[PDB]
């Protein structure tokens, strides 16, 4: 998709108005790049709160996993974007989602010293003993 590639670029670059236009013109909000990043992943990790909300309202898959197993919540938690962490949880993000190391958004936030995020994730039911099994 040409609109898919354009929407990925707009979301990464934080171009709010270019994102609203592409969506209105038929852009796949669930477009995926060559390592599984979606527009929501790219807005989340770049700190673009308005684009995160726009994407979620236009049906963005809140638990889309990239080639590391990161959800947009993993990326928001490791980069310290508290408002995006909250918006994602409100849109039903799995607070205990596991990446391919068995790490939750909480493990990643703790490792990066984002202790405000650690506190918020514990508030929305993050389990410190979350364990991935086979």
């Amino acid at each position: 998709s040409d609109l898919g590639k354009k929407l990925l670029e707009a979301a990464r670059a934080g171009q709010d108005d270019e994102v609203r236009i592409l969506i209105a013109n038929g852009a796949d909000v669930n477009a995926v790049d060559n390592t599984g990043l979606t527009p929501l992943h790219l807005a989340a990790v770049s700190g673009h709160l308005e684009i995160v909300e726009v994407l979620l309202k236009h049906g963005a898959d809140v638990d889309a996993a990239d080639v590391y197993g990161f959800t947009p919540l993993h990326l928001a938690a490791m980069t310290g974007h508290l408002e995006i962490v909250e918006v994602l949880l409100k849109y039903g993000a799995d607070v205990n989602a596991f990446d391919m190391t068995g790490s939750t958004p909480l493990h990643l936030a703790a490792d990066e010293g984002h202790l405000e995020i650690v506190e918020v994730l514990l508030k929305y039911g993050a389990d410190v003993n979350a364990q991935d099994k086979f």
Binding site: N34, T35, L37, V45, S46, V67, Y68, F70, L75, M78, T79, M100, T101, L108, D111, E112, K133, F134
Partner: protein, 290 residues
């Protein structure tokens, strides 16, 4: 063509490994997450159908990968846990590298900052120095077999094109496949040795700092002519010490490149900041003090 058993049984130990998710494939191999049904320990299982091993150069590749890798143990080499077979498949049990490879990092980041290039390149060169001192030439170093563990530590893998040097000054004359970064002496009749690994590290260094490959164009013929003629350009924004080290490694005459130890001791490795740890954000977006 045979389905892979859902449970891998080692006929020696009788350890059972449950087959989980597909991880990757290339040549005759697929790789899967596998777990000890008893200990719950998780490995990468490389699985190769004997239907793809009927030719001499293919049986050679599988056997050579196993005999070379099983003899290796280093901080910067993929852990080798074992190998076994049934009637239809060869199974190789490896260390699972949960943070993918420098290929995935490259596709997301393109050009790294210099400190991050310095962090990764030192680990590549240490792993390769351990290989060269054990008389192992890898011959196929590429972003995709420079694996990362949970600590973003580089692990060299995929020893399928590797060879053992049997005597001093030996020039190997054959390869059982086509290397990713073709050294000019591989394109010639004169044979090759350890210095193909230094060429490939030069290509990887250029790619990490520049964000594209030094020789690759659309036409394999144009590419090979560029290699033979040593035609490439280092953009002007690369620091001089880094540019100079790319030029030492990307030379036509293999005797003029640095040895793996001379490469490890290059000024590049000491000329700027040496990160202790990279943050996990470095897989997706640039770092500041790194």
């Amino acid at each position: 063509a045979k389905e892979i058993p859902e449970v891998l049984v080692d006929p020696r130990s009788r350890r059972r490994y449950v087959r989980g998710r597909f991880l990757g494939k290339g040549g005759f191999a697929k790789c899967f997450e596998i777990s000890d049904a008893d200990t719950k320990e998780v490995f990468a299982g490389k699985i190769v159908p004997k239907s793809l091993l009927l030719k001499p150069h293919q049986r050679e590749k599988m056997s050579m990968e196993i005999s070379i890798h099983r003899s290796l143990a280093h901080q910067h080499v993929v852990g080798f846990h074992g190998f076994f077979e049934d009637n239809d498949f060869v199974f190789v049990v490896l260390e699972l590298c949960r943070r993918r490879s420098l290929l995935e990092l490259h596709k997301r980041r393109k050009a790294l900052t210099e400190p991050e290039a310095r962090y990764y390149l030192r680990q590549i060169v240490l792993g390769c120095q351990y290989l060269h001192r054990n008389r192992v030439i890898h011959r196929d170093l590429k972003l995709g077999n420079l694996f990362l563990n949970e600590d973003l530590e580089v692990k060299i893998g995929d020893f399928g094109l590797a060879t053992k040097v049997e005597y001093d000054g030996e020039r190997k004359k054959t390869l059982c496949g086509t290397p990713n970064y073709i050294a000019p002496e591989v394109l010639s009749k004169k044979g090759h040795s350890f210095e193909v690994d230094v060429w490939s590290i030069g290509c990887i260094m250029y790619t990490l700092l520049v964000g594209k490959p030094p020789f690759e164009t659309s036409c394999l013929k144009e590419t090979y002519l560029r290699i033979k003629k040593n035609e490439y350009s280092i953009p002007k924004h690369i620091n001089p010490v880094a540019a100079s080290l790319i030029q030492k490694m990307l030379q036509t005459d293999p005797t003029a490149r640095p040895t793996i130890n001379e490469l490890l001791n290059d000024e590049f490795f000491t000329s700027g900041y040496i990160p202790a740890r990279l943050p996990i954000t470095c897989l997706t977006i640039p770092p500041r003090f790194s």
